Enzyme design. Structure first.
Site, PDB file in Angstrom:
ATOM      1  N   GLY A  25       0.755  -1.250   0.000  1.00  0.00           N
ATOM      2  CA  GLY A  25       0.000   0.000   0.000  1.00  0.00           C
ATOM      3  C   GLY A  25       0.783   1.296   0.000  1.00  0.00           C
ATOM      4  O   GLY A  25       0.195   2.370  -0.117  1.00  0.00           O
ATOM      5  N   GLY A  27       2.196   3.542   2.306  1.00  0.00           N
ATOM      6  CA  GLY A  27       1.739   4.716   3.049  1.00  0.00           C
ATOM      7  C   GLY A  27       0.252   4.768   3.322  1.00  0.00           C
ATOM      8  O   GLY A  27      -0.162   5.362   4.308  1.00  0.00           O
ATOM      9  N   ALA A  28      -0.552   4.153   2.459  1.00  0.00           N
ATOM     10  CA  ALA A  28      -2.012   4.245   2.562  1.00  0.00           C
ATOM     11  C   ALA A  28      -2.550   3.657   3.867  1.00  0.00           C
ATOM     12  O   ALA A  28      -3.483   4.201   4.467  1.00  0.00           O
ATOM     13  CB  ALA A  28      -2.662   3.557   1.377  1.00  0.00           C
ATOM     14  N   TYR A  29      -1.973   2.543   4.303  1.00  0.00           N
ATOM     15  CA  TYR A  29      -2.416   1.902   5.546  1.00  0.00           C
ATOM     16  C   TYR A  29      -1.384   2.065   6.652  1.00  0.00           C
ATOM     17  O   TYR A  29      -1.444   1.390   7.676  1.00  0.00           O
ATOM     18  CB  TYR A  29      -2.706   0.421   5.325  1.00  0.00           C
ATOM     19  CG  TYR A  29      -3.118   0.061   3.924  1.00  0.00           C
ATOM     20  CD1 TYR A  29      -4.403   0.342   3.445  1.00  0.00           C
ATOM     21  CD2 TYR A  29      -2.230  -0.580   3.077  1.00  0.00           C
ATOM     22  CE1 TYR A  29      -4.769  -0.004   2.150  1.00  0.00           C
ATOM     23  CE2 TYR A  29      -2.588  -0.928   1.802  1.00  0.00           C
ATOM     24  CZ  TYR A  29      -3.847  -0.641   1.336  1.00  0.00           C
ATOM     25  OH  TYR A  29      -4.149  -1.006   0.045  1.00  0.00           O
ATOM     26  N   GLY A  30      -0.456   2.983   6.455  1.00  0.00           N
ATOM     27  CA  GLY A  30       0.634   3.173   7.397  1.00  0.00           C
ATOM     28  C   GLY A  30       1.795   2.306   6.955  1.00  0.00           C
ATOM     29  O   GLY A  30       1.970   2.050   5.765  1.00  0.00           O
ATOM     30  N   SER A  31       2.585   1.858   7.915  1.00  0.00           N
ATOM     31  CA  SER A  31       3.708   1.000   7.611  1.00  0.00           C
ATOM     32  C   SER A  31       3.204  -0.428   7.740  1.00  0.00           C
ATOM     33  O   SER A  31       3.098  -0.956   8.850  1.00  0.00           O
ATOM     34  CB  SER A  31       4.845   1.262   8.585  1.00  0.00           C
ATOM     35  OG  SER A  31       4.830   2.616   8.959  1.00  0.00           O
ATOM     36  N   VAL A  32       2.863  -1.028   6.605  1.00  0.00           N
ATOM     37  CA  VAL A  32       2.314  -2.385   6.589  1.00  0.00           C
ATOM     38  C   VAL A  32       3.111  -3.254   5.636  1.00  0.00           C
ATOM     39  O   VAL A  32       3.374  -2.834   4.507  1.00  0.00           O
ATOM     40  CB  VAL A  32       0.849  -2.395   6.128  1.00  0.00           C
ATOM     41  CG1 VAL A  32       0.336  -3.829   5.972  1.00  0.00           C
ATOM     42  CG2 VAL A  32      -0.010  -1.599   7.086  1.00  0.00           C
ATOM     43  N   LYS A  47       1.283  -4.770  10.529  1.00  0.00           N
ATOM     44  CA  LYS A  47       1.313  -3.314  10.673  1.00  0.00           C
ATOM     45  C   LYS A  47       2.103  -2.934  11.906  1.00  0.00           C
ATOM     46  O   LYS A  47       1.808  -3.412  13.014  1.00  0.00           O
ATOM     47  CB  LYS A  47      -0.098  -2.747  10.767  1.00  0.00           C
ATOM     48  CG  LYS A  47      -0.157  -1.231  10.951  1.00  0.00           C
ATOM     49  CD  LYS A  47      -1.566  -0.739  10.765  1.00  0.00           C
ATOM     50  CE  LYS A  47      -1.680   0.782  10.871  1.00  0.00           C
ATOM     51  NZ  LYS A  47      -3.100   1.212  10.633  1.00  0.00           N
ATOM     52  N   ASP A 162     -11.348  -1.030   9.417  1.00  0.00           N
ATOM     53  CA  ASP A 162     -11.093   0.389   9.764  1.00  0.00           C
ATOM     54  C   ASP A 162     -12.241   0.983  10.560  1.00  0.00           C
ATOM     55  O   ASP A 162     -12.421   2.210  10.553  1.00  0.00           O
ATOM     56  CB  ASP A 162     -10.937   1.152   8.449  1.00  0.00           C
ATOM     57  CG  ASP A 162      -9.954   2.249   8.498  1.00  0.00           C
ATOM     58  OD1 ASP A 162      -9.947   3.023   9.482  1.00  0.00           O
ATOM     59  OD2 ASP A 162      -9.218   2.370   7.485  1.00  0.00           O
TER      60      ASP A 162
END
Ligand SMILES: C[C@@H]1CN(Cc2ccc(F)cc2)[C@@H](C)CN1C(=O)c1cc2c(C(=O)C(=O)N(C)C)cn(C)c2cc1Cl
Ligand SMILES: CCCCCCCCO[C@@H]1O[C@H](CO)[C@@H](O)[C@H](O)[C@H]1O
Length: 331
Positions: A25, A27-32, A47, A162
């Site tokens: 992703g 950046g979209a879901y953070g650091s995943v 995550k 979410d």
């Protein structure tokens, strides 16, 4: 005892059971990272929370996210396979990792701006509503249901997680508060409409446009709705608009299954009090082929009292640590 960890730069420090770490992703879901769980044979997403105890608010957010995911135990809702920290004590505790199923795609990816078949839409909306029923039963309102928040695998098994504004209830657009859970039902209606027709229901260019397109479909507020508006500025502005009648959804969604159209009529009502609930929607004849009243489970009571509390960084941290330690993985 405690699993062996290894360190890698994407400096993630995870248990050996998780292999093949690969960022997703961006950046979209953070650091995943996507990963392979050698213990279960499952593809997972790991995550790493960012700066989780940097501040009171970061700390409270960390606690909120962990609590929520630990509580959500349902086939159609993202929950936790694992939670871990490299810390072996509280004084050491600075990192928090969450693990869930790697679904691999979200709804956008499945529709591709194309028409789905009616059968396929039934299956997808059923799953969303099944998951929503569970979420609403815990006294949670999602508030931002949209295709990017609906995870799906290749068998179109779906989990609720979410562009941005197109799925939002009009009361949310207008900063109402006192929000009903049926805000999420509005969002389901917009999603369903799009899956059936292949086009965004309300593709507004900005906020005001979005409300203009909504009103053209579902009409201007009737007297029954206007009597519940306490803001006189809002009340007075609404009445000064040209009256428009509700459109006939039967003409708008031509070709659609008439039971799909009937369901859309019941979800896309301006007055949130008049919108069908998730439980009620699941019992609608549209879903006859999937509905099972004995396998539409609800959640345990969910204590959100922490939201009203103003605590210190080390308090939110220790409470988060307690939750890490008490986690029990699903069977
Ligand atoms: C729910 C999981 C876990 N993950 C975050 C997460 C949430 C909770 C937790 F505990 C751990 C991780 C989501 C951001 C995305 N996710 C996915 O399966 C997913 C995965 C993807 C995805 C990819 O996997 C990918 O980049 N490729 C190349 C297949 C591309 N998109 C658009 C995706 C959308 C979703 Cl929803
Ligand atoms: C200018 C566009 C009109 C938007 C009207 C939105 C009506 C949504 O409906 C309202 O939702 C509130 C909770 O959010 C409830 O308290 C009200 O009883 C309900 O009528």
């Amino acid at each position: 005892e405690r699993p062996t960890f290894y360190r890698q730069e994407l400096i993630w420090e995870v248990p050996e059971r998780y292999q093949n770490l690969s960022p997703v992703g961006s950046g979209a879901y953070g650091s995943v990272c996507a990963a392979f769980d050698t213990k279960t044979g499952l593809r997972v997403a790991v995550k790493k929370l960012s700066r989780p105890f940097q501040s009171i608010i970061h700390a409270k957010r960390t606690y909120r996210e962990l609590r929520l995911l630990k509580h959500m135990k349902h086939e159609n809702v993202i929950g936790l396979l694992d939670v871990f920290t490299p810390a072996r004590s509280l004084e050491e505790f600075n990192d928090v990792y969450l693990v869930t199923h790697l679904m691999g795609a979200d709804l956008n990816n499945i529709v591709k701006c194309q028409k789905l078949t009616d059968d396929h839409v039934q299956f997808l909306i059923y799953q969303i509503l099944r998951g929503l029923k569970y979420i609403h039963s815990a006294d949670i309102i999602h508030r931002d249901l949209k295709p990017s928040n609906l995870a799906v695998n290749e068998d179109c098994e779906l989990k609720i997680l979410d562009a941005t504004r197109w799925y939002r209830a009009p009361e949310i657009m207008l900063n109402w508060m006192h929000y009903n859970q049926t805000v999420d039902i509005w969002s389901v209606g917009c999603i369903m409409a799009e899956l059936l027709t292949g086009r965004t229901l309300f593709p507004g260019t900005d906020h005001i446009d979005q409300l203009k397109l909504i009103l053209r479909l579902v009409g201007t507020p009737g007297a029954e709705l206007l009597k519940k508006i306490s803001s006189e500025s809002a009340r007075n502005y609404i009445q000064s608009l040209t009256q428009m009648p509700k459109m006939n959804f039967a003409n708008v969604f031509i070709g659609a299954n008439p039971l799909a159209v009937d369901l859309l009529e019941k979800m896309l009502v301006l007055d949130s009090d008049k919108r069908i609930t998730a439980a009620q929607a699941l019992a609608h004849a549209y879903f006859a082929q999937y509905h099972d009243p004995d396998d539409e489970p609800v959640a345990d009571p969910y204590d959100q009292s922490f939201e009203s509390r103003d605590l210190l960084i080390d308090e939110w941290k220790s409470l988060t640590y307690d939750e890490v330690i008490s986690f029990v993985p699903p069977p």
